[PDB]
Write an enzyme that holds these catalytic residues in place. Sequence first.
Site, mmCIF file in Angstrom:
data_model
loop_
_atom_site.group_PDB
_atom_site.id
_atom_site.type_symbol
_atom_site.label_atom_id
_atom_site.label_comp_id
_atom_site.label_asym_id
_atom_site.label_seq_id
_atom_site.Cartn_x
_atom_site.Cartn_y
_atom_site.Cartn_z
ATOM 1 N N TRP A 89 -9.315 5.796 -1.273
ATOM 2 C CA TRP A 89 -9.634 6.497 -2.506
ATOM 3 C C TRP A 89 -8.560 6.126 -3.527
ATOM 4 O O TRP A 89 -7.503 5.614 -3.169
ATOM 5 C CB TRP A 89 -9.736 8.024 -2.314
ATOM 6 C CG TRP A 89 -8.522 8.661 -1.664
ATOM 7 C CD1 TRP A 89 -7.310 8.948 -2.256
ATOM 8 C CD2 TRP A 89 -8.403 9.078 -0.295
ATOM 9 N NE1 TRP A 89 -6.459 9.520 -1.337
ATOM 10 C CE2 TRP A 89 -7.111 9.625 -0.132
ATOM 11 C CE3 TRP A 89 -9.261 9.022 0.810
ATOM 12 C CZ2 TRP A 89 -6.655 10.112 1.094
ATOM 13 C CZ3 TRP A 89 -8.815 9.531 2.022
ATOM 14 C CH2 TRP A 89 -7.522 10.067 2.153
ATOM 15 N N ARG B 103 -0.147 4.643 2.839
ATOM 16 C CA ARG B 103 -0.123 4.442 4.288
ATOM 17 C C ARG B 103 0.185 5.704 5.096
ATOM 18 O O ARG B 103 0.099 5.651 6.331
ATOM 19 C CB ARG B 103 0.877 3.315 4.651
ATOM 20 C CG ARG B 103 0.378 1.859 4.298
ATOM 21 C CD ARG B 103 1.444 0.845 4.623
ATOM 22 N NE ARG B 103 2.469 0.727 3.566
ATOM 23 C CZ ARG B 103 3.646 0.127 3.725
ATOM 24 N NH1 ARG B 103 3.951 -0.416 4.895
ATOM 25 N NH2 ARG B 103 4.519 0.040 2.715
ATOM 26 N N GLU C 84 -4.149 3.563 -11.016
ATOM 27 C CA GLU C 84 -4.857 2.289 -10.918
ATOM 28 C C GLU C 84 -5.943 2.212 -11.980
ATOM 29 O O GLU C 84 -6.139 1.171 -12.621
ATOM 30 C CB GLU C 84 -5.482 2.116 -9.530
ATOM 31 C CG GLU C 84 -4.527 2.109 -8.354
ATOM 32 C CD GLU C 84 -5.281 1.868 -7.032
ATOM 33 O OE1 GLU C 84 -5.742 0.716 -6.819
ATOM 34 O OE2 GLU C 84 -5.433 2.832 -6.225
ATOM 35 N N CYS D 172 0.837 -1.190 0.000
ATOM 36 C CA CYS D 172 0.000 0.000 0.000
ATOM 37 C C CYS D 172 0.880 1.251 0.000
ATOM 38 O O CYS D 172 1.642 1.479 0.949
ATOM 39 C CB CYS D 172 -0.939 0.019 1.213
ATOM 40 S SG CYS D 172 -1.986 1.504 1.220
HETATM 41 C C1 HEM Z 1 -6.492 6.382 1.521
HETATM 42 C C2 HEM Z 1 -6.098 6.231 0.243
HETATM 43 C C3 HEM Z 1 -5.393 4.936 -0.239
HETATM 44 C C4 HEM Z 1 -4.638 4.872 -1.332
HETATM 45 C C5 HEM Z 1 -4.294 6.068 -2.295
HETATM 46 C C6 HEM Z 1 -4.160 3.518 -1.455
HETATM 47 C C7 HEM Z 1 -3.356 3.063 -2.457
HETATM 48 C C8 HEM Z 1 -3.054 1.754 -2.725
HETATM 49 C C9 HEM Z 1 -2.468 1.240 -3.958
HETATM 50 C C10 HEM Z 1 -2.095 2.065 -5.226
HETATM 51 C C11 HEM Z 1 -2.317 -0.083 -3.782
HETATM 52 C C12 HEM Z 1 -1.786 -1.121 -4.785
HETATM 53 C C13 HEM Z 1 -2.969 -1.268 -5.738
HETATM 54 C C14 HEM Z 1 -2.896 -2.534 -6.531
HETATM 55 O O1 HEM Z 1 -2.863 -3.601 -5.875
HETATM 56 O O2 HEM Z 1 -2.868 -2.470 -7.794
HETATM 57 C C15 HEM Z 1 -2.784 -0.445 -2.461
HETATM 58 C C16 HEM Z 1 -2.796 -1.728 -1.959
HETATM 59 C C17 HEM Z 1 -3.277 -2.040 -0.714
HETATM 60 N N1 HEM Z 1 -3.878 -1.169 0.163
HETATM 61 FE FE1 HEM Z 1 -3.932 0.787 0.046
HETATM 62 N N2 HEM Z 1 -4.659 2.760 -0.409
HETATM 63 C C18 HEM Z 1 -5.448 3.604 0.360
HETATM 64 C C19 HEM Z 1 -6.159 3.205 1.491
HETATM 65 C C20 HEM Z 1 -6.102 1.958 2.096
HETATM 66 C C21 HEM Z 1 -6.853 1.487 3.260
HETATM 67 C C22 HEM Z 1 -7.871 2.380 3.993
HETATM 68 C C23 HEM Z 1 -6.482 0.203 3.509
HETATM 69 C C24 HEM Z 1 -6.913 -0.793 4.622
HETATM 70 C C25 HEM Z 1 -7.448 -0.312 5.759
HETATM 71 C C26 HEM Z 1 -5.494 -0.159 2.505
HETATM 72 C C27 HEM Z 1 -4.848 -1.382 2.413
HETATM 73 C C28 HEM Z 1 -4.216 -1.887 1.301
HETATM 74 C C29 HEM Z 1 -3.782 -3.257 1.115
HETATM 75 C C30 HEM Z 1 -3.930 -4.423 2.117
HETATM 76 C C31 HEM Z 1 -3.223 -3.330 -0.086
HETATM 77 C C32 HEM Z 1 -2.608 -4.571 -0.723
HETATM 78 C C33 HEM Z 1 -3.701 -5.205 -1.554
HETATM 79 C C34 HEM Z 1 -3.056 -6.420 -2.146
HETATM 80 O O3 HEM Z 1 -1.932 -6.765 -1.685
HETATM 81 O O4 HEM Z 1 -3.634 -7.062 -3.059
HETATM 82 N N3 HEM Z 1 -5.297 0.925 1.682
HETATM 83 N N4 HEM Z 1 -3.222 0.700 -1.842
HETATM 84 C C1 LIG Z 2 -7.698 0.385 -0.163
HETATM 85 C C2 LIG Z 2 -7.270 0.586 -1.572
HETATM 86 C C3 LIG Z 2 -7.270 1.853 -2.139
HETATM 87 C C4 LIG Z 2 -6.877 2.010 -3.472
HETATM 88 N N1 LIG Z 2 -6.851 3.237 -4.087
HETATM 89 N N2 LIG Z 2 -6.508 0.910 -4.174
HETATM 90 C C5 LIG Z 2 -6.507 -0.323 -3.620
HETATM 91 C C6 LIG Z 2 -6.118 -1.410 -4.388
HETATM 92 C C7 LIG Z 2 -6.089 -2.691 -3.857
HETATM 93 C C8 LIG Z 2 -5.688 -3.772 -4.786
HETATM 94 C C9 LIG Z 2 -5.082 -4.964 -4.478
HETATM 95 C C10 LIG Z 2 -4.792 -5.879 -5.452
HETATM 96 C C11 LIG Z 2 -5.088 -5.588 -6.775
HETATM 97 O O1 LIG Z 2 -4.770 -6.501 -7.747
HETATM 98 C C12 LIG Z 2 -3.854 -7.581 -7.505
HETATM 99 C C13 LIG Z 2 -3.400 -7.933 -8.905
HETATM 100 C C14 LIG Z 2 -2.117 -8.409 -9.223
HETATM 101 C C15 LIG Z 2 -1.785 -8.681 -10.555
HETATM 102 C C16 LIG Z 2 -2.747 -8.457 -11.542
HETATM 103 C C17 LIG Z 2 -2.550 -8.671 -12.779
HETATM 104 N N3 LIG Z 2 -2.390 -8.808 -13.904
HETATM 105 C C18 LIG Z 2 -4.009 -7.977 -11.232
HETATM 106 C C19 LIG Z 2 -4.334 -7.707 -9.914
HETATM 107 C C20 LIG Z 2 -5.692 -4.376 -7.085
HETATM 108 C C21 LIG Z 2 -6.061 -3.913 -8.466
HETATM 109 N N4 LIG Z 2 -5.986 -2.436 -8.409
HETATM 110 C C22 LIG Z 2 -5.991 -3.488 -6.087
HETATM 111 C C23 LIG Z 2 -6.456 -2.887 -2.534
HETATM 112 C C24 LIG Z 2 -6.866 -1.789 -1.767
HETATM 113 C C25 LIG Z 2 -6.885 -0.510 -2.310
HETATM 114 CL CL LIG Z 3 -9.283 -1.289 -8.817
#
Ligand code: HEM
Ligand SMILES: Cc1cc(N)nc2cc(-c3ccc(OCc4ccc(C#N)cc4)c(CN)c3)ccc12
Ligand SMILES: [Cl-]
Lengths: 404, 403
Positions: B279, B110, B284, B107
Amino acid sequence: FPRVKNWEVGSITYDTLSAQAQQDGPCTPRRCLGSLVFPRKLAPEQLLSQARDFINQYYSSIKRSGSQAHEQRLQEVEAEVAATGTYQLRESELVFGAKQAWRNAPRCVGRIQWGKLQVFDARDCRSAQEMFTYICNHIKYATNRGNLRSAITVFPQRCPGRGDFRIWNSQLVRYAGYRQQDGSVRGDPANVEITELCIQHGWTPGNGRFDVLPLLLQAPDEPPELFLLPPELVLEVPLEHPTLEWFAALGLRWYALPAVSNMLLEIGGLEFPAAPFSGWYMSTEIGTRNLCDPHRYNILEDVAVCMDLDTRTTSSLWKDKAAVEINVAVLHSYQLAKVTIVDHHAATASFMKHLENEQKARGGCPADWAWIVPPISGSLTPVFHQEMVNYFLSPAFRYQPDPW
Amino acid sequence: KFPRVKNWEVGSITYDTLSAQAQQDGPCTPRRCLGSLVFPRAPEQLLSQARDFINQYYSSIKRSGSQAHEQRLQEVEAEVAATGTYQLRESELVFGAKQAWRNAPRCVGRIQWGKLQVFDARDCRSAQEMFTYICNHIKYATNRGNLRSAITVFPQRCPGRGDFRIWNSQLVRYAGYRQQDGSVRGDPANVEITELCIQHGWTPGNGRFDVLPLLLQAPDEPPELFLLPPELVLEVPLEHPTLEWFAALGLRWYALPAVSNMLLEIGGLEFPAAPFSGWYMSTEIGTRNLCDPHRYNILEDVAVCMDLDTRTTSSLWKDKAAVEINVAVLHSYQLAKVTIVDHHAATASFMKHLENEQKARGGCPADWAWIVPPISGSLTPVFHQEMVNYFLSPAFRYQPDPW
Ligand code: HEM
Ligand SMILES: Cc1cc(N)nc2cc(-c3ccc(OCc4ccc(C#N)cc4)c(CN)c3)ccc12
Ligand SMILES: [Cl-]
Ligand code: HEM
Ligand SMILES: Cc1cc(N)nc2cc(-c3ccc(OCc4ccc(C#N)cc4)c(CN)c3)ccc12
Ligand SMILES: C[C@H](O)[C@H](O)[C@H]1CNc2nc(N)[nH]c(=O)c2N1
Ligand SMILES: C[C@H](O)[C@H](O)[C@H]1CNc2nc(N)[nH]c(=O)c2N1
Ligand SMILES: [Cl-]
Ligand SMILES: [Gd]
Ligand SMILES: [Zn+2]
């Protein structure tokens, strides 16, 4: 055996080659250090094991494993070490080992080309002036009026007692970096230290920000001596843009030949601390890293000013628009000059085909995702969506401490 | 013997002492690094996790080693001895949910980890109650465009009863329909859940941006279908500030990214249903969701309308088209007054998060490949930051799909 998925096609492969990786990397089950540039830090009984291994894969690669001269070459190595503590590669083993070292380089995106490598055997070099002639031959051959050809020149191996051959420059062609009163740099800030050294070993400094450095070449034991690269040997490319007429007036330029000269080559237990190699540039190295890194020439905002971009707010994506035009100018200027260059889309697509070749030929391929994915447009290239396994195979190019 | 970490833009060095406390084991070994893989993967071990989390909680309220601290430790192990499990106090749950976000290595958002609204739905009783809780979460978090981070925590895993599960991977997603041509209409990432919704009685649509219904599973129950009221799902139609034909593509996206298929683990307790939302970062939507070749795959369409030369890769037509799509997303969300952050502002705030965490804890777990944005990587400061990836608890974890 690691399972490896390509998320764009859904295809699955297993990397069986990784089970044979010996020299251990920096990661543990508790923490991944995959993103560190330099991992961690940098009785001839061990020599025999590494030598017999390398001889075995040399004879595998020409089918002739089992009986015949293969059975014979193993004994010469044993008798050679048992009589001297070291040994000598045959010319063909040298050539094979250099190609494997490149083939095994996990950070190189150009390895589709790994079988086309010109190897100059300089193992009878015994002088710094001799080194200079070898390096000038290499530069002339590799540059080749702009039709670049991959090449390596192999200087004599480290030997127990008495020192190494070493090139003090990180590449054969580099631009000087000059400090001043504000500590800011005119020229390339990556090269301030070697520039400082060149001056303190005799060099008269120069004008401005694209002065080609002299070479600091070290023969064993005797200290390093400066050599001046003849200007007709260093092909350079003035940078212009196909539709932004003012870009040329920025006075930017880059050199044609990327020749890394500070890495150590290891083959069959032997170590060659001077073995400079060269290929040709991928355009993002010049346009994105060399020209736009904030600790390099840092030209991005100057270009954005000239483009009249909204530098007042990050969300105009002014950084992104200026960077694209700088890479366009690099590709345009190198093509106009008829100097070989490859764009990051063409390069990554060839790496994918290389991964397919390697899967059939060897059951995997050590790849370093953070270095294979380009510094702009990452997820627009196919390698972004390819999972990758990173490990160390020998023969290898390794980093090594600087000679100071 | 703590990893040395360098920033190459500034030249500064730090040591990540926190990684030495890493509470689980990732997939790398000294033989081979697997850092690029997307999925890297009782009573006595329950107690060690529980004691560790209680110690963290009492540290954060600057009350470590006090008798309240020892009382809580003794109560927990007494309760595990009697029931096989234990119950979190409300303040422990709020603390643990925030720590799970703070610990998420992928993330980039954070810096905001202390501003998280925690809704306690641990009393939830059925799928119909779960739906009401989810609707209020969407309403609160969306806030008519001024988005607020939130999480809703449904009852924990418990011996004797099945799990609460949300089958959807996000609370808002677009349907993906197989076609005649073997193609997909809509979002190809959602083909499986779309098929599941239909076979549970949903009458499908036939557009590219049809909002999916929710499939909500109560313990020991088949999943039940629920339609979101359309006035709850805020969407943003996409236009470009200087390419007037872009509005005619009819592209849209939703305001609220609410991930709903991850497991929340706090002190050995597992919450298989705990949807959370923040948000969007504009890449993304603009680069991954719209330009990925296995998603909406619009990059060639847009480049052709832009009259770029798509015959050769050396014109960089892909990079030029991708930049303008990302501009459309930022301009469109700002016009609609929906919170959105661009990848330059987001990565700058993350670097400040790393500095804050170095002071507070001696390090920060971070997954470089996920922190660096999918376009313009080295134009952002995180590219030039070495990072250390490891698993701390409390944590959000991936879990198998319930089907
Ligand atoms: C407040 C604005 C936030 C932004 C801009 C943000 C941004 C992002 C982005 C860009 C990613 C990677 C996206 C992807 O997987 O393609 C991500 C992953 C993640 N976010 Fe954040 N996030 C936000 C809030 C939060 C909140 C509120 C939580 C949990 C309470 C959170 C928990 C996570 C987790 C666990 C991942 C990893 C998801 C995964 O590993 O598949 N985020 N976040
Ligand atoms: C709280 C929050 C805010 C925000 N703003 N964003 C988030 C995005 C994720 C998130 C995790 C895994 C994902 O995907 C895993 C993946 C890995 C490889 C491929 C491929 N190919 C596709 C998906 C994708 C897709 N955004 C989002 C989780 C939380 C978010
Ligand atoms: Cl998404
Ligand atoms: C022929 C065209 C070639 C291309 C397009 C190419 C491309 C690249 C790129 C883009 C990188 C990483 C960029 C960076 O480090 O900043 C790299 C690294 C590397 N290349 Fe290649 N390369 C080529 C030829 C060669 C040759 C001929 C050799 C050796 C004989 C070689 C060996 C290596 C090694 C060892 C690395 C990693 C170096 C290190 O870790 O410092 N490459 N290459
Ligand atoms: C044959 C060939 C062709 C080509 N076209 N390219 C090459 C690039 C390398 C290579 C390795 C490490 C580097 O650098 C280490 C480094 C890491 C982080 C920062 C930072 N910040 C700076 C330097 C740099 C510099 N490109 C190049 C080696 C061979 C190449
Ligand atoms: C901090 C990080 O390890 C460093 O910036 C790496 C990332 N990826 C890279 N990728 C390439 N091709 N070249 C580099 O120098 C780097 N540097
Ligand atoms: C194959 C590769 O691991 C995969 O595509 C990863 C790379 N980095 C990523 N980074 C982010 N932020 N989101 C992602 O989905 C991914 N996907
Ligand atoms: Cl370079
Ligand atoms: Gd227009
Ligand atoms: Zn690793």
